[PDB]
Amino acid sequence: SNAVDICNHALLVGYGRVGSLLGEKLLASDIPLVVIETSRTRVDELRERGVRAVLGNAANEEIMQLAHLECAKWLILTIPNGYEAGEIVASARAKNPDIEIIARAHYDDEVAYITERGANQVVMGEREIARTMLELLETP
């Protein structure tokens, strides 16, 4: 079907370095999870493991419908390009003011672009690197 029936779920875009770590934790926490991936290999792996996964690009409206964006509680973007992410965020937000949207970025101008398009939270890798390094340096 390439389709899901579930609602009130975390809709996770990407299952690479970032998404796989979120996925594994979300699954442990019994938060209903649907993953969208462009990678056939990753979708096949996820399905083999009993995780709901929709194959396709999250920028495609039919793919979002297949993944039940309309009734998801969270939209979590873990793709690396912040402009691409911003476009997805814009489209999701237009259709639902309430959905919690979290996205990845790597540059300040991406953060701004994504935030302007309605994300609740943007997580910038390089800021988290600096913050975590400072935490290590400040530890006795």
What number of other Cβ atoms are within 10 A of residue 14's Cβ? 24
SS3 54: strand
- Do 52 and 4 touch, CB atoms closer than 8 A? yes
> Could you tell me which stretch among 2-10, 36-44, 64-72, 92-100 binds ligand AMP (CB under 6 A)?
36-44
31-70 positions binding a copy of itself, by CB under 8 A = 31
- Do 60 and 88 touch, CB atoms closer than 8 A? no
Cβ at position 69, least distance to ligand AMP in Å: 12
Contacts of 1 (CB under 8 A, 6+ apart): 66
Cβ at position 64, least distance to a copy of itself in Å: 20
Residue 14 engages ligand AMP in binding (rule: CB under 6 A): yes
Residue 78 engages a copy of itself in binding (rule: CB under 8 A): yes
- State the sign of the Cα–Cα–Cα–Cα dihedral 103, 20, 31, 129: negative
Closest CA to 37 of 51, 18, 20, 57: 57
Residue 27 touches which of ligand AMP, a copy of itself, none (Cβ within 5-8 Å per kind): none
> Where do contacts with ligand AMP occur on this chain (CB under 6 A)?
13-19, 36-39, 42, 57-59, 78-80, 126
> Where do contacts with a copy of itself occur on this chain (CB under 8 A)?
10, 16-19, 21-22, 25-26, 29, 31, 74, 76, 78, 102, 104, 106-108, 121, 123-134, 136-138
